[PDB]
Coordinates of C-alpha atoms in Angstrom, one line a residue:
Chain A
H1 CA 175.9 98.8 43.9
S2 CA 172.4 100.2 44.0
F3 CA 169.2 98.2 44.4
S4 CA 165.6 99.0 43.7
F5 CA 163.4 99.4 46.8
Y6 CA 160.8 97.5 44.9
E7 CA 163.0 94.5 44.5
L8 CA 164.1 94.4 48.2
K9 CA 160.5 94.7 49.4
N10 CA 159.5 91.6 47.5
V11 CA 162.5 89.4 47.7
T12 CA 162.2 89.7 51.5
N13 CA 158.4 89.0 51.2
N14 CA 157.4 92.6 51.9
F15 CA 159.7 92.5 54.9
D16 CA 158.0 89.5 56.5
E17 CA 158.3 90.2 60.2
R18 CA 158.1 86.5 61.3
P19 CA 161.4 84.8 62.5
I20 CA 163.1 82.4 60.0
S21 CA 162.5 79.8 62.7
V22 CA 158.8 80.0 61.8
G23 CA 159.5 80.5 58.1
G24 CA 159.4 84.2 58.0
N25 CA 162.3 86.5 57.0
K26 CA 163.2 88.3 60.2
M27 CA 166.8 87.5 61.0
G28 CA 167.5 90.0 63.8
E29 CA 167.3 93.5 65.2
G30 CA 170.3 95.7 65.4
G31 CA 172.6 98.0 63.3
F32 CA 169.8 100.5 63.7
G33 CA 167.2 98.7 61.7
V34 CA 165.7 95.3 61.2
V35 CA 167.6 92.6 59.2
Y36 CA 165.6 90.4 56.8
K37 CA 166.8 87.4 54.7
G38 CA 166.4 88.1 50.9
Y39 CA 167.1 86.5 47.6
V40 CA 168.8 88.6 44.8
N41 CA 169.8 86.9 41.6
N42 CA 170.4 83.3 42.6
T43 CA 172.2 84.3 45.8
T44 CA 171.0 84.9 49.3
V45 CA 171.5 88.3 51.0
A46 CA 171.0 90.1 54.2
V47 CA 168.7 93.2 54.0
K48 CA 168.7 95.8 56.7
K49 CA 165.8 98.2 56.7
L50 CA 166.7 101.2 58.8
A51 CA 164.9 102.0 62.1
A52 CA 165.5 103.5 65.5
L53 CA 168.9 108.3 60.7
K54 CA 170.0 109.3 57.2
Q55 CA 173.3 110.4 58.7
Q56 CA 173.7 106.9 60.0
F57 CA 173.0 105.6 56.5
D58 CA 175.5 107.8 54.6
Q59 CA 178.1 107.2 57.4
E60 CA 177.8 103.5 57.2
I61 CA 178.5 103.5 53.5
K62 CA 181.4 105.9 53.9
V63 CA 183.0 103.5 56.4
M64 CA 182.2 100.5 54.2
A65 CA 183.8 102.2 51.2
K66 CA 187.2 102.4 52.9
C67 CA 187.0 99.1 54.6
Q68 CA 186.7 95.9 52.6
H69 CA 188.7 92.9 53.7
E70 CA 188.5 89.1 53.8
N71 CA 187.4 89.1 57.4
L72 CA 184.8 91.9 57.2
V73 CA 181.1 91.7 56.2
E74 CA 181.0 93.1 52.6
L75 CA 178.3 95.7 51.9
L76 CA 176.8 94.7 48.5
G77 CA 174.7 97.8 48.0
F78 CA 171.8 100.0 49.2
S79 CA 168.3 101.4 48.4
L80 CA 165.5 103.1 53.2
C81 CA 167.7 99.9 53.2
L82 CA 171.2 98.3 53.2
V83 CA 172.3 95.0 51.6
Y84 CA 175.0 92.6 52.8
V85 CA 176.7 89.3 52.0
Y86 CA 174.7 86.7 53.9
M87 CA 176.5 84.5 56.4
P88 CA 174.7 81.2 56.7
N89 CA 176.4 80.1 60.0
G90 CA 175.3 83.1 62.0
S91 CA 177.2 84.6 64.9
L92 CA 180.2 83.3 66.7
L93 CA 178.0 83.8 69.9
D94 CA 175.4 81.4 68.4
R95 CA 178.0 78.8 67.5
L96 CA 179.8 79.0 70.8
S97 CA 176.6 78.4 72.6
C98 CA 175.6 75.7 70.1
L99 CA 172.2 77.4 69.7
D100 CA 169.6 75.3 67.9
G101 CA 171.7 72.2 68.4
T102 CA 174.6 72.9 66.0
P103 CA 177.9 71.0 66.8
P104 CA 180.4 72.6 69.0
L105 CA 183.3 74.3 67.1
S106 CA 186.6 72.5 67.4
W107 CA 189.7 74.2 68.9
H108 CA 191.4 74.3 65.5
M109 CA 188.4 76.0 64.0
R110 CA 188.2 78.4 67.0
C111 CA 191.8 79.3 66.4
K112 CA 191.1 80.1 62.8
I113 CA 188.2 82.3 63.8
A114 CA 190.3 84.2 66.3
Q115 CA 193.0 84.8 63.6
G116 CA 190.3 85.8 61.2
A117 CA 188.6 88.3 63.5
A118 CA 191.9 89.8 64.4
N119 CA 192.9 90.3 60.7
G120 CA 189.7 92.2 60.1
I121 CA 190.3 94.4 63.1
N122 CA 193.9 95.0 62.0
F123 CA 192.4 96.2 58.7
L124 CA 190.1 98.6 60.4
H125 CA 193.0 100.1 62.5
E126 CA 195.4 100.2 59.6
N127 CA 192.7 102.3 57.9
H128 CA 192.2 104.5 61.0
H129 CA 188.7 103.4 61.9
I130 CA 187.3 102.2 65.2
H131 CA 184.5 99.6 65.5
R132 CA 183.4 100.3 69.1
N133 CA 181.2 97.2 69.3
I134 CA 183.5 94.2 68.9
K135 CA 181.6 91.4 70.5
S136 CA 180.9 87.7 69.6
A137 CA 177.4 88.5 68.5
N138 CA 178.9 90.8 65.8
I139 CA 181.3 88.3 64.4
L140 CA 179.5 86.4 61.7
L141 CA 180.5 83.1 60.1
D142 CA 180.1 82.3 56.4
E143 CA 179.8 78.9 54.7
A144 CA 183.4 78.1 55.5
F145 CA 183.3 79.5 59.0
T146 CA 185.4 82.4 58.0
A147 CA 185.1 85.2 60.6
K148 CA 183.3 88.3 59.2
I149 CA 183.0 91.4 61.4
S150 CA 179.5 92.9 61.3
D151 CA 177.2 95.7 62.6
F152 CA 179.5 98.7 62.0
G153 CA 176.7 100.7 63.6
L154 CA 179.1 102.5 65.9
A155 CA 182.1 103.0 63.6
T156 CA 192.8 112.0 72.8
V157 CA 189.2 112.0 71.6
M158 CA 186.2 112.3 73.9
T159 CA 182.4 111.9 73.3
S160 CA 179.2 113.1 75.1
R161 CA 177.6 110.0 73.5
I162 CA 179.0 107.0 75.4
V163 CA 178.1 103.8 73.7
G164 CA 179.0 100.1 73.2
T165 CA 178.0 96.8 74.9
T166 CA 179.1 97.3 78.5
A167 CA 180.1 93.7 79.2
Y168 CA 182.7 94.2 76.4
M169 CA 183.8 97.9 77.0
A170 CA 187.2 99.0 78.1
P171 CA 187.4 101.3 81.1
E172 CA 188.5 104.4 79.1
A173 CA 185.6 103.7 76.6
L174 CA 183.1 103.5 79.5
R175 CA 184.3 107.0 80.5
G176 CA 183.8 108.1 76.9
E177 CA 187.2 108.1 75.2
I178 CA 187.4 107.0 71.6
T179 CA 190.5 105.0 70.7
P180 CA 191.6 101.8 68.9
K181 CA 192.9 100.5 72.2
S182 CA 189.3 99.9 73.3
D183 CA 188.6 97.5 70.4
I184 CA 191.6 95.5 71.6
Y185 CA 189.9 95.2 75.0
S186 CA 186.6 94.1 73.7
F187 CA 188.5 91.5 71.5
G188 CA 190.0 90.2 74.7
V189 CA 186.5 89.3 76.0
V190 CA 185.8 87.6 72.7
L191 CA 188.8 85.4 73.1
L192 CA 187.7 84.5 76.6
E193 CA 184.3 83.4 75.1
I194 CA 186.2 81.2 72.6
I195 CA 188.4 79.6 75.2
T196 CA 185.5 78.9 77.6
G197 CA 182.3 78.9 75.6
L198 CA 180.8 81.1 78.3
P199 CA 178.7 84.3 77.6
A200 CA 180.4 87.6 78.5
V201 CA 177.8 88.2 81.2
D202 CA 175.6 85.8 83.2
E203 CA 173.3 87.3 85.8
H204 CA 173.1 84.0 87.5
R205 CA 176.9 83.3 87.5
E206 CA 179.8 84.1 89.8
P207 CA 181.5 86.2 88.4
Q208 CA 178.8 87.8 86.3
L209 CA 181.3 89.4 83.9
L210 CA 183.4 86.9 82.0
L211 CA 186.2 89.5 81.9
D212 CA 186.4 89.0 85.7
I213 CA 187.8 85.4 85.5
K214 CA 191.0 87.1 84.6
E215 CA 191.5 88.2 88.2
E216 CA 190.5 84.7 89.5
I217 CA 193.3 83.2 87.4
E218 CA 195.9 85.8 88.4
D219 CA 195.1 85.4 92.1
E220 CA 195.4 81.7 91.4
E221 CA 191.9 81.1 92.8
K222 CA 191.3 79.3 89.5
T223 CA 193.2 78.0 86.5
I224 CA 192.7 78.3 82.7
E225 CA 192.1 74.5 82.8
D226 CA 189.1 75.1 85.0
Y227 CA 187.5 77.3 82.5
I228 CA 188.3 75.6 79.1
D229 CA 185.2 74.9 77.2
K230 CA 184.6 71.1 77.7
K231 CA 182.7 70.8 74.4
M232 CA 185.9 70.1 72.4
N233 CA 188.4 67.2 71.9
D234 CA 191.4 68.8 70.2
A235 CA 192.4 71.7 72.5
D236 CA 195.9 71.1 73.7
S237 CA 197.1 73.1 76.8
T238 CA 200.0 74.8 75.1
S239 CA 198.0 76.6 72.4
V240 CA 195.1 77.2 74.8
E241 CA 197.4 78.9 77.2
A242 CA 198.9 80.8 74.3
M243 CA 195.5 82.2 73.4
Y244 CA 194.6 83.0 77.0
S245 CA 197.8 84.9 77.3
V246 CA 196.7 87.1 74.4
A247 CA 193.3 87.6 75.9
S248 CA 194.9 88.6 79.2
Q249 CA 197.1 91.3 77.5
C250 CA 194.1 92.7 75.6
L251 CA 192.3 92.9 78.9
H252 CA 194.9 95.2 80.5
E253 CA 193.1 98.0 82.3
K254 CA 195.8 100.5 81.2
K255 CA 195.1 101.2 77.5
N256 CA 198.8 102.0 76.8
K257 CA 199.9 98.7 78.3
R258 CA 197.7 96.8 75.8
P259 CA 199.1 95.2 72.6
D260 CA 198.3 96.9 69.3
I261 CA 196.3 94.8 66.9
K262 CA 199.4 93.9 64.9
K263 CA 201.2 92.1 67.8
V264 CA 197.8 90.5 68.5
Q265 CA 198.0 89.1 65.0
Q266 CA 201.6 88.0 65.6
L267 CA 200.8 86.2 68.8
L268 CA 197.8 84.3 67.4
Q269 CA 199.9 83.4 64.3
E270 CA 202.7 82.1 66.6
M271 CA 199.9 80.2 68.4
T272 CA 199.7 77.7 65.5
Chain B
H1 CA 159.5 113.3 114.8
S2 CA 156.6 114.4 112.5
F3 CA 155.6 117.8 111.0
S4 CA 152.7 119.8 109.6
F5 CA 152.7 120.2 105.8
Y6 CA 151.5 123.8 106.1
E7 CA 153.9 124.9 108.8
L8 CA 156.5 123.5 106.4
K9 CA 155.0 125.3 103.5
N10 CA 154.9 128.5 105.6
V11 CA 158.5 128.4 106.9
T12 CA 159.9 127.7 103.4
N13 CA 158.1 130.7 101.9
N14 CA 155.5 128.7 99.9
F15 CA 158.4 126.4 98.9
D16 CA 160.1 129.2 97.0
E17 CA 161.6 127.4 94.1
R18 CA 164.1 130.3 93.4
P19 CA 167.6 129.5 94.5
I20 CA 169.0 130.9 97.8
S21 CA 171.5 133.2 96.0
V22 CA 168.7 135.3 94.6
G23 CA 166.4 135.3 97.7
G24 CA 164.5 132.0 97.4
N25 CA 164.6 128.9 99.5
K26 CA 165.9 126.3 97.1
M27 CA 169.2 124.8 98.2
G28 CA 169.4 121.9 95.7
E29 CA 167.7 119.0 93.9
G30 CA 168.5 115.4 95.0
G31 CA 167.2 112.3 96.6
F32 CA 164.2 112.3 94.3
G33 CA 163.1 115.8 95.4
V34 CA 163.8 119.4 95.8
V35 CA 165.5 120.6 99.0
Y36 CA 164.5 123.9 100.6
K37 CA 165.9 126.0 103.5
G38 CA 163.3 126.4 106.3
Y39 CA 163.1 127.5 109.9
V40 CA 161.0 126.6 112.8
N41 CA 161.1 126.1 116.6
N42 CA 164.5 127.7 117.1
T43 CA 165.9 125.3 114.5
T44 CA 167.1 126.0 111.0
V45 CA 166.2 123.0 108.8
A46 CA 166.6 121.5 105.3
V47 CA 163.4 120.3 103.7
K48 CA 163.2 117.8 100.9
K49 CA 159.8 117.7 99.2
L50 CA 159.4 114.5 97.2
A51 CA 158.2 114.9 93.6
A52 CA 157.4 112.5 90.8
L53 CA 155.9 105.7 95.8
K54 CA 155.2 106.2 99.5
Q55 CA 157.1 102.9 100.3
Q56 CA 160.3 104.8 99.3
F57 CA 159.4 107.8 101.5
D58 CA 159.0 105.3 104.3
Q59 CA 162.0 103.3 103.2
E60 CA 164.5 106.1 103.8
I61 CA 163.0 106.8 107.2
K62 CA 163.9 103.1 108.0
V63 CA 167.5 103.7 106.7
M64 CA 167.7 106.9 108.7
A65 CA 166.4 105.5 112.0
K66 CA 169.2 103.0 112.0
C67 CA 172.0 105.1 110.6
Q68 CA 172.7 107.9 113.1
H69 CA 176.4 108.8 113.3
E70 CA 178.5 111.9 113.9
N71 CA 179.5 112.0 110.2
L72 CA 176.1 111.3 108.7
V73 CA 173.4 113.9 108.1
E74 CA 170.7 113.5 110.7
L75 CA 167.0 113.2 109.9
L76 CA 164.8 115.3 112.2
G77 CA 161.4 114.0 111.0
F78 CA 158.9 113.9 108.3
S79 CA 155.5 115.1 106.9
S80 CA 152.8 113.1 105.1
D81 CA 150.1 115.4 103.9
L82 CA 155.6 114.4 101.2
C83 CA 158.6 115.9 103.1
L84 CA 161.7 114.8 104.9
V85 CA 163.3 117.2 107.4
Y86 CA 167.0 117.3 108.1
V87 CA 169.5 119.1 110.3
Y88 CA 170.8 122.1 108.4
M89 CA 174.6 122.2 107.6
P90 CA 175.6 125.9 107.5
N91 CA 178.8 125.5 105.6
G92 CA 177.2 123.7 102.7
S93 CA 179.0 121.2 100.6
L94 CA 182.7 120.2 100.4
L95 CA 182.5 121.0 96.8
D96 CA 181.4 124.6 97.5
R97 CA 184.1 125.1 100.1
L98 CA 186.8 123.6 97.8
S99 CA 185.8 126.0 95.1
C100 CA 185.4 128.9 97.6
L101 CA 182.0 129.5 96.2
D102 CA 180.6 132.9 97.2
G103 CA 184.0 134.2 98.3
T104 CA 184.5 132.0 101.3
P105 CA 188.1 131.5 102.3
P106 CA 190.0 128.4 101.2
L107 CA 190.1 125.5 103.6
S108 CA 193.6 124.9 105.1
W109 CA 195.3 121.6 104.5
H110 CA 194.9 120.7 108.2
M111 CA 191.1 121.2 107.9
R112 CA 191.0 119.2 104.6
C113 CA 192.6 116.3 106.4
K114 CA 189.9 116.4 109.2
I115 CA 187.2 116.4 106.6
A116 CA 188.7 113.5 104.7
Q117 CA 188.8 111.6 108.0
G118 CA 185.3 112.5 108.9
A119 CA 183.9 111.4 105.5
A120 CA 185.8 108.0 105.7
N121 CA 184.3 107.5 109.2
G122 CA 180.8 108.1 107.8
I123 CA 181.4 105.8 104.9
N124 CA 182.7 103.2 107.3
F125 CA 179.5 103.4 109.3
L126 CA 177.5 102.9 106.2
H127 CA 179.4 99.8 105.0
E128 CA 179.3 98.2 108.5
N129 CA 175.5 98.6 108.5
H130 CA 175.6 97.0 105.0
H131 CA 174.7 100.1 103.1
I132 CA 175.9 101.1 99.6
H133 CA 175.9 104.8 99.2
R134 CA 176.2 104.8 95.4
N135 CA 176.8 108.5 95.2
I136 CA 179.9 109.5 97.1
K137 CA 180.9 112.9 95.6
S138 CA 182.2 116.1 97.2
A139 CA 178.7 117.9 96.7
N140 CA 177.1 115.2 98.9
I141 CA 179.6 115.7 101.7
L142 CA 178.1 118.5 103.8
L143 CA 179.9 120.6 106.4
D144 CA 178.5 121.8 109.7
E145 CA 179.3 124.9 111.7
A146 CA 182.5 123.2 112.9
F147 CA 183.4 121.9 109.5
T148 CA 182.6 118.4 110.6
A149 CA 182.1 116.3 107.5
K150 CA 178.4 115.1 107.2
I151 CA 177.8 112.5 104.5
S152 CA 174.3 112.9 102.9
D153 CA 171.9 111.7 100.3
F154 CA 172.1 107.9 100.8
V155 CA 174.0 94.8 78.6
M156 CA 173.1 94.5 75.0
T157 CA 174.0 97.7 73.0
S158 CA 173.3 100.8 75.1
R159 CA 174.4 104.2 76.1
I160 CA 175.4 105.3 79.6
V161 CA 174.2 108.5 81.1
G162 CA 175.5 108.2 84.7
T163 CA 177.9 110.8 86.0
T164 CA 181.1 109.2 84.9
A165 CA 183.3 111.6 86.9
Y166 CA 182.9 109.8 90.2
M167 CA 181.8 106.3 89.1
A168 CA 184.1 103.3 89.0
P169 CA 184.3 101.2 85.9
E170 CA 182.4 98.2 87.4
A171 CA 179.7 100.6 88.5
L172 CA 179.3 101.9 85.0
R173 CA 178.9 98.3 83.9
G174 CA 176.1 98.1 86.4
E175 CA 177.5 96.1 89.3
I176 CA 176.4 97.4 92.7
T177 CA 179.0 97.2 95.5
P178 CA 180.8 99.1 98.4
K179 CA 184.1 98.8 96.5
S180 CA 182.5 101.5 94.2
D181 CA 181.9 103.8 97.1
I182 CA 185.7 103.5 97.7
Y183 CA 186.5 104.5 94.1
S184 CA 184.3 107.6 94.3
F185 CA 186.0 108.5 97.6
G186 CA 189.3 108.4 95.7
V187 CA 188.1 111.1 93.4
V188 CA 187.0 113.1 96.4
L189 CA 190.5 112.9 97.9
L190 CA 191.9 114.2 94.6
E191 CA 189.5 117.1 94.8
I192 CA 190.7 117.8 98.3
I193 CA 194.3 117.8 97.2
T194 CA 193.9 119.8 94.0
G195 CA 191.0 122.1 94.5
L196 CA 190.0 120.9 91.0
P197 CA 186.5 119.8 90.1
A198 CA 186.1 116.1 89.2
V199 CA 185.2 116.9 85.6
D200 CA 185.9 120.0 83.5
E201 CA 184.8 119.9 79.9
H202 CA 187.3 122.6 79.0
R203 CA 190.3 121.0 80.8
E204 CA 192.9 118.5 79.8
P205 CA 192.2 115.9 81.2
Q206 CA 188.5 116.4 81.5
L207 CA 188.2 113.9 84.3
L208 CA 190.2 114.5 87.4
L209 CA 190.8 110.8 88.0
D210 CA 193.0 110.8 84.9
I211 CA 195.9 112.7 86.6
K212 CA 196.6 109.5 88.4
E213 CA 197.7 108.1 85.0
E214 CA 199.6 111.3 84.2
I215 CA 201.5 110.9 87.5
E216 CA 202.2 107.1 87.2
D217 CA 203.5 107.6 83.7
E218 CA 205.8 110.3 85.2
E219 CA 204.4 113.0 82.8
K220 CA 203.6 114.9 86.0
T221 CA 203.9 114.9 89.8
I222 CA 201.3 115.3 92.5
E223 CA 203.0 118.6 93.4
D224 CA 202.1 120.1 90.0
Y225 CA 198.4 119.6 90.9
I226 CA 198.5 120.7 94.6
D227 CA 195.8 123.3 95.3
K228 CA 197.7 126.6 95.4
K229 CA 195.1 128.0 97.7
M230 CA 196.7 126.5 100.9
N231 CA 199.8 127.5 102.9
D232 CA 200.1 124.6 105.3
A233 CA 200.3 121.6 102.9
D234 CA 203.5 119.7 103.8
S235 CA 204.5 117.5 100.9
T236 CA 205.0 114.4 103.1
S237 CA 201.3 114.4 104.3
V238 CA 200.0 115.4 100.9
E239 CA 201.9 112.5 99.3
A240 CA 200.4 110.3 102.0
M241 CA 196.8 111.3 101.1
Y242 CA 197.6 111.0 97.4
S243 CA 198.7 107.4 98.1
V244 CA 195.4 106.7 99.7
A245 CA 193.7 108.2 96.7
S246 CA 195.7 106.2 94.2
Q247 CA 194.8 102.9 96.0
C248 CA 191.1 103.8 96.1
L249 CA 191.2 104.5 92.4
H250 CA 192.5 101.0 91.5
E251 CA 190.9 100.0 88.2
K252 CA 190.0 96.5 89.5
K253 CA 187.6 96.7 92.4
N254 CA 189.3 93.9 94.5
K255 CA 192.7 95.6 94.7
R256 CA 191.1 98.6 96.4
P257 CA 191.2 98.8 100.2
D258 CA 188.0 98.4 102.2
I259 CA 186.7 101.5 104.0
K260 CA 188.4 100.3 107.3
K261 CA 191.8 100.5 105.7
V262 CA 191.1 103.9 104.3
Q263 CA 190.4 105.1 107.8
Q264 CA 193.7 103.7 109.1
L265 CA 195.9 105.1 106.3
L266 CA 194.1 108.5 106.7
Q267 CA 194.8 108.3 110.5
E268 CA 198.5 107.5 110.3
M269 CA 198.7 110.5 108.0
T270 CA 198.3 113.0 110.8

């Protein structure tokens, strides 16, 4: 679908730069532009106005055209601007950290979100795309807390342009390779966030990278039990250990030793 | 020791920016400056003129005053009118010698082993004095007239720019630690074995450290990669050094040996 630039301008209050916290329309910065909350028809939408180009714009639509799935953020249209289905519950990162005082997600709900995110990655890989920025801040949650993968801004093959969020990036990705195996790795870090409720990096924490508690648990210096988010009351040890096992396998340093997204799906389905 | 800026200017030919190989005095660019060949007082010297602070100029002179060792490049003095003066290493870098730059003969296997040892010693001295080098690579390993190894020059969405070829994964993430120095040294051992450069944009694989995966997966053997420009490499000792290299190149920083263990394994090897 195609929107008028006039409409977008106004339904977002001329791109009001103030945070929604204050009553403005500014929802975030990312995906190479700024994201404003807007109202089209009687439905709320997310409006990205591009900033640091046109290649990025055409490319983002080309990838959106092939990839629509239940667990991916649906591109509604365009206008220079882009328009998405609005997800009222924000990022998985926000919810895990209970930002703004929202209630901690239950284990059952966390499990659903992990299955959802994985089905949406499985759809990307089936259709031969790579996301390259799988991280909890890019997993959105709609009104039902369905996982919706977002910010397709970055979606043997090498690249001179190495990019991603380094706390989530696989070692071959860090070196510049481009392969679906790296998405799996990043998803491993996302699972660790879900199990623990801890951010992927914490300057003031030992270890600073969440992905490093994997070694701590292998060397038996720690246990999964030690790291399980305490902000829930329904997380039985069997299914928690089941999900940690998946995370562990995603986090293998040798890309070929990693599960493909489909056995990731199978393992999280078996989890419940 | 301390120098005159103009005597330094004089003996470097007005700091002739042209490279040595066409008759200038520029040897390289590094350590936040340009390095020139100079001569004075019956001493050939290397001069690094800092370019765009003085705390840092005085901060290295601290580091250098402490760290004097047979396998570290020695600081001879300084000028503040900004220049650091070093001992000149007439056989240039390990990289140059591995690549037989300018027609120089290949280094034998036996010599390569000595150099590997010498570098591990210099790295050991650094880590014992709680120093992270951050830039172990074969172009930073100089060779003196006797081919003694002299070590020298010591998270939202983003893109990396750092020279991936030598850097460990945790270092690319931003961690700063001596276990990274070890990983880089592993790449250097692979250079010593293969004669190959760490990265080659027109090679499969581009990064040298990837042959470790090729070998583990039994798609290749370390023999297939042995520098053919040697006639004294016995497979037993080569396989020994390769094993040291493989361990340094461990993907998780805590499974790698510390520099003391690298010294031992390298010693047993001869």
